[PDB]
Design a protein around this nucleic acid. Structure first.
Lengths: 206, 143, 80, 67, 69, 142, 60, 145, 63
RNA sequence: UAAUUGCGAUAACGAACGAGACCUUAACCUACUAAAUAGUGGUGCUAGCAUUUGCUGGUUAUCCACUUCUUAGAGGGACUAUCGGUUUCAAGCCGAUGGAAGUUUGAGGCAAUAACAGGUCUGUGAUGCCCUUAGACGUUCUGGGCCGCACGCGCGCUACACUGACGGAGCCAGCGAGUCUAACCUUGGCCGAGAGGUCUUGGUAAUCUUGUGAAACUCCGUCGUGCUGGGGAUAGAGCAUUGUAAUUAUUGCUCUUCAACGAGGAAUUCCUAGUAAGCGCAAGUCAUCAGCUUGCGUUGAUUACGUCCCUGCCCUUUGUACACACC
């Protein structure tokens, strides 16, 4: 890769794997496709970046949240429940570890394992609280491809969060266990559980 | 080609020198140093019982090195953490003075440090070269 | 000797709302009425080169339950 | 929302009425004209006004403006 | 309960099993076996003798090991 | 003698980070230490980032002194990655050529995570009635 | 910038509305090198209400 | 790398100071089951007794158990400073003590009895079951028992 | 299991008494010659593609 | 439209108060005037590693230069600009591009008319009336009390742990305060496990405390789901600190006792971007005492960009036997 030298070293695993291709921590963004139409344009995996941490600004205009990579949008949903709010550095360290666990468990691209999980968990149709009259019944509206990513990540973290509570495992582990059961709807995934529950209800009250 | 302590990982550096000190026999580990807590803010005594004093001492050497002068006071707050006050909220609490002081006096006996003008201590040429020689060792530790 | 008192007149007492405030005191202290002493001071202010004027009297005007009569004229601003 | 007040729009209607040939379609130049033919007490207003004068301009040169 | 001391028979398991799974962490040894977990952390420094398991990611919060070679 | 050096800064929140770019042997140092060692940790490459999107060779002829103050652990990081990428484009601006400079700009703004334009976000004043800028104390009615 | 924060209410009635008053103090210094006359001259030719002036001799 | 096993040398649940002490819990925190020893004290006694703190309570020979009990009751004779002790400057003997075992409930019963006998205010508070340190009792302290 | 994609042409307004549901008009993706009005849950703009469960339906006003 | 904000419709025409303008604060400025109480580059003098010139420092001014970062004067800058999509193709709204900034730029200060039997006579040497005035309801002094504890309600702090606790090591803020006829903010030296003691010192302060080396946090390890080393209430024993004075523990320190709490029922508050939440810090009080408030920065998100379903207020229509006005 033509290793040039300067007064302050700079490592070789740095020079090469970077200036060639802008990999993740060191994972490739290329050769990873959103294996479900209608959810592209949103699940942002096309602009590469090194760490899932940026001085974002996605709360000014409405839909700008989408030019945000799903990796970082996944990380950001990790840091919650009061005692965890604002601790992003911890979360990125959780996610970086979560991808290594995944990659080990099933080859592939871990960033693809994640993207797979989001697509298969976003509820296609859903239930709304209609007027109903007294004992207010329901109606079966569909859900936006933005929400399909929103509530997905939402489920995939609440899953791993409540999983790894008073349990011997770590967050990176129960998140690599919840991403894997969602990358191929094993139905042992908390998210896949909720998803096949919403569509089930939205099919029953239409 | 000319190594500073400002070229070594602070974790790597201080890990290294705090072993070069313990295996060097002479510093001056205080009479307590097996019962003490390092700060009233702390809860338990340091887990590395045998040579935690060597840990701190090394860290201070590095710390004074990259400065002009730093007295007992500045060091007591540098190593002070948070203090659980039980059912009340946490505040900052300064660390033990005897500890940092006895470090700064035992470090004069080995000429790593010395009383400076303007108050406080300062790293000397004897120690300046001493951390600049062990800076290499933990920077050349690539086989 | 290190401190000396001087004595000016005034920059037209029809613009200083302090001298006028003191005037309203004395007028009412001189037994004069509410609406008389109020309109009187106001009209003096208007004919003094001001843009506007407001003289409000609060308290018990007709005894018992206290009230508040506002005697204003000209142009006023309030806010900024 | 950004709805210009009458004090602004009044100045806009007034200038154009008696200063159309000098006024242009550009904010920056208009802004400088206002300082030569009008006494304004704050910078923002003058910028606020000169910005609306140019708003009318860019649509006068597109057909006559209502009033 | 769990095991906070090697029963030697327990040392038979560790040397002949861990090369089966391609992911071995602190909790892995706790779930499959019943190590104390305090003696799992030490079990991992040991298992990197000549490297029955190979490292890819070592960290205070998380230990990510793999199968052999 | 006094060298052909240039000087830019980079602010993130309350972290203003001065930079100096003189013609030299390609050293890149922050706070008396080489850039390899920037130990807020995971955000390491955040300061490497400008040295890769623009070609590692651009820096070999120039020295980088970056001194940092204020802000916090993360804010200083984004403040130094910004001071660096801003002095390079300011080096080609003065000492080199216009064509080359915009080539460097184009490499950043096509990726820009602040990099060479200041993030204007600041904290909001608290006002009486609560602890946060918007947050309000709990009320109890009846 | 001097700051004084108080409660708007005398006594304790109502929603808890606070205030905050400021006093702003501006400081600056000018250095000069001038003999006998221009010293007391410069102190009294440039005097003004509201503006405080003090001149230091030198050294210690 | 203490990947050592030991056959039938390990003996969980032994007995010291008339109390039951689990073996599977580490040394420092094992002893702390004893009424009178806590985290900092049990951390210190085992240091003076040249015990390798990494072990579990189930390890350590009866010899290594004897050098701990002995130090523990005669603490001040082993370079254990008096501030580390739970009953210094008694009131009826003037010596520095560090009462353990049953004698924490004993000397507590005594101290409470002492200033109850002499009918001190604090004592009467200990008698009436109320709170003896000047805290409030109007809004808190409910539920009782 | 039959599943139909649908791409937005135009967005009407917002129904539901609370304002939760949004009415929209879509093509039928694989067949441009169709056009159906559907109710949505989340935020939908134009050009984003729905995922229709039952590919007939076509509802209207909602509280 | 945030707005009686505006386009317009027009028996109205033209206006004033309020809103807006305004003022403050936070954002931009390599353009101007400057700086030993703010900085940087060179240079002396000097230390260390390398000696290959190099890299990292010391030096209150060694000398010279400059104003990028800091300060604050004087100004510039935005006007939702430019283009497009919409609509009476009007006010305006939406999008994209540019820009330090495009949500009233963010946040505030100010704030009409008229009203309330809202609170305050315990802030006032503001006050009418009454009360009382030497066995005082005046003043002062000793002691006690305002905290008294079967219980009901409000605001809060710490928590239930592994997204953690403990032990090391890493080390980064901003808003602020500070001593005369006096004892404040306190560096440094020594002493002490600590809390604290003693000897000096600087500072009436961009100078000294102070780079307020703050906490969360980063890392490395110990513990390993066990009311556990999570949690720190109750209580015993001892050392100090404020003060004339500490018992009814003022507060701090050390040892020990090691509770309830395993995510909280019906209900219910707050919140839309550096916002919530978490984190600590200065300031008020202050001899001593913050789990309180007024501010500040550190880390820093999920969701919404909508509606009138609920709770309110506004306008219009309407009913009235209400006008002391649906108490």
């Amino acid at each position: 890769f033509t290793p040039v030298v300067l007064a302050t070293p700079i490592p070789e695993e740095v020079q090469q794997a970077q200036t060639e291709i802008k990999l993740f921590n060191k994972w490739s963004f290329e050769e990873v496709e959103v294996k479900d139409a209608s959810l592209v344009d949103y699940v942002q995996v096309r602009q590469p970046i090194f760490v899932a941490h940026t001085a974002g600004r996605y709360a000014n205009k409405r839909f700008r949240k989408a030019q945000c990579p799903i990796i970082e949008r996944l990380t950001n949903s990790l840091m919650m429940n009061g005692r965890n709010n604002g601790k992003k550095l911890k979360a990125v360290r959780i996610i970086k570890h979560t991808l290594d666990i995944i990659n080990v468990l099933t080859d592939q691209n871990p960033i693809q394992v994640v993207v797979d999980a989001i697509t298969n968990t976003g509820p296609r149709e859903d239930t709304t609280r209609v007027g109903g009259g007294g004992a207010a019944r329901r109606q079966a509206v569909d859900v936006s491809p933005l929400r399909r990513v929103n509530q997905a990540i939402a489920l995939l973290t609440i899953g791993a969060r409540e999983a790894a509570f008073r349990n011997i495992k770590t967050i990176a582990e129960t998140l690599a266990e919840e991403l894997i059961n969602a990358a191929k709807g094993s139905s042992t995934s908390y998210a896949i559980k909720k998803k096949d529950e919403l569509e089930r209800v939205a099919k029953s009250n239409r | 080609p000319g190594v500073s302590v400002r070229d070594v990982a602070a974790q790597d550096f201080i890990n290294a020198y705090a072993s070069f000190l313990q295996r060097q026999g002479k510093l001056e580990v205080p009479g307590y140093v097996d019962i003490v807590k390092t700060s009233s803010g702390n809860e338990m005594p340091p887990q590395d019982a045998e040579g935690w004093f060597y840990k701190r001492a090394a860290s201070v050497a590095r710390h004074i090195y990259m400065r002009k002068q730093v007295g007992v006071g500045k060091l007591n707050k540098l190593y002070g953490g948070a203090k659980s006050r039980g059912v009340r909220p946490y505040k900052h609490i300064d660390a033990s003075g005897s500890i940092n002081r006895k470090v700064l006096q035992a470090l004069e006996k080995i000429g790593i440090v010395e009383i400076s003008p303007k108050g406080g201590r300062r790293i000397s040429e004897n120690g300046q070269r001493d951390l600049d020689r062990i800076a290499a060792q933990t920077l050349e530790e690539d086989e | 000797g290190t401190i000396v008192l001087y004595a000016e007149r005034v920059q037209d007492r029809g613009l200083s709302a302090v001298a006028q405030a003191e005037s309203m005191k004395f007028k009412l202290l001189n037994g004069l009425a509410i609406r008389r002493a109020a309109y009187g001071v106001v009209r003096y202010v208007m004919e003094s080169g001001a843009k506007g004027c407001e003289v409000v009297v609060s308290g018990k005007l007709r005894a018992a339950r206290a009230k508040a009569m506002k005697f204003a004229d000209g142009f006023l601003i309030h806010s900024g | 929302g950004r709805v210009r007040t009458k004090t602004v729009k009044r100045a806009s209607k007034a200038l154009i009425e008696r200063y159309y040939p000098k006024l242009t379609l550009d904010f920056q130049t208009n802004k400088r004209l206002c300082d030569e033919i009008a006494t304004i007490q704050s910078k923002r207003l003058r910028n606020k006004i000169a910005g609306y004068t140019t708003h009318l301009m860019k649509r006068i040169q597109k057909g006559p403006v209502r009033g | 309960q769990h095991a906070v001391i090697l029963d030697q028979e327990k040392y038979d398991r560790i040397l002949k099993e861990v090369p089966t799974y391609r992911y071995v962490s602190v909790s892995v040894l706790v779930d499959r076996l019943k190590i104390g977990g305090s003696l799992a952390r030490i079990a991992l420094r040991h298992l990197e003798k000549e490297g029955i398991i190979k490292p890819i990611s070592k960290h205070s919060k998380q230990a990510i090991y793999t199968r052999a070679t | 003698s006094a060298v052909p050096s240039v000087q830019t800064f980079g602010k993130k929140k309350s972290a203003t980070a001065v930079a100096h770019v003189k013609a030299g042997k390609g050293l890149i140092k922050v706070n008396g230490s080489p850039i390899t060692l920037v130990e807020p940790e995971i955000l390491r490459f955040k300061v490497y980032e400008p040295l890769l999107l623009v070609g590692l060779d651009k820096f070999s002829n120039i020295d980088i002194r970056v001194r940092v103050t204020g802000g916090g652990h993360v804010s200083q990081v984004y403040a130094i990655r910004q001071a660096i990428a801003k002095g390079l484009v300011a080096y080609h601006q003065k000492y080199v050529d216009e064509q080359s400079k915009n080539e460097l700009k184009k490499a950043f703004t096509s990726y820009d995570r602040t990099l060479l334009i200041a993030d204007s976000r600041r904290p909001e004043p608290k006002k009486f009635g609560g602890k946060g800028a918007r947050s309000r104390f709990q009320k109890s009615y009846r | 910038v001097l700051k004084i924060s108080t409660r708007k209410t005398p006594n304790g009635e109502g929603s808890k509305t606070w205030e905050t008053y400021e006093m702003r103090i501006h400081k600056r210094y000018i250095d000069l090198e001038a003999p006998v006359q221009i010293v007391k001259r410069i102190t009294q030719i440039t005097i003004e209400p509201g503006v405080d002036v003090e001149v230091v001799v030198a050294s210690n | 790398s203490l990947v050592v096993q030991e056959q039938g040398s390990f003996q969980h649940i032994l007995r010291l100071l008339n109390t039951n002490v689990d073996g599977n819990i580490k040394i420092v925190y094992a002893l702390t089951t004893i009424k009178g020893v806590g985290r900092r004290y049990s951390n210190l006694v085992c240091k003076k007794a040249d015990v390798d703190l990494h072990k579990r309570a189930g390890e350590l020979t009866q010899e290594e158990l004897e050098r701990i009990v002995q130090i523990m009751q005669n603490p001040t004779h082993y370079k254990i400073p008096a501030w580390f002790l739970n009953r210094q400057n008694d009131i009826t003997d003037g010596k520095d003590y560090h009462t353990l075992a049953n004698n924490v409930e004993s000397k507590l019963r005594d101290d409470l009895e002492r200033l109850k006998k002499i009918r001190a205010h604090r004592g009467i508070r200990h008698f009436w079951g109320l709170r003896v340190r000047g805290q409030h009792t109007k809004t808190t302290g409910r539920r009782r028992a | 299991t039959p599943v139909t994609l649908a791409k937005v042409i135009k967005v009407l307004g917002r129904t539901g008494s609370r304002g939760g549901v949004t009415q929209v008009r879509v093509e039928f993706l694989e067949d441009t010659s169709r056009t159906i009005v559907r109710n949505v849950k989340g935020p939908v703009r134009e050009n984003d593609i729905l995922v229709l469960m039952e590919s007939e339906r076509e509802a209207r006003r909602l509280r």
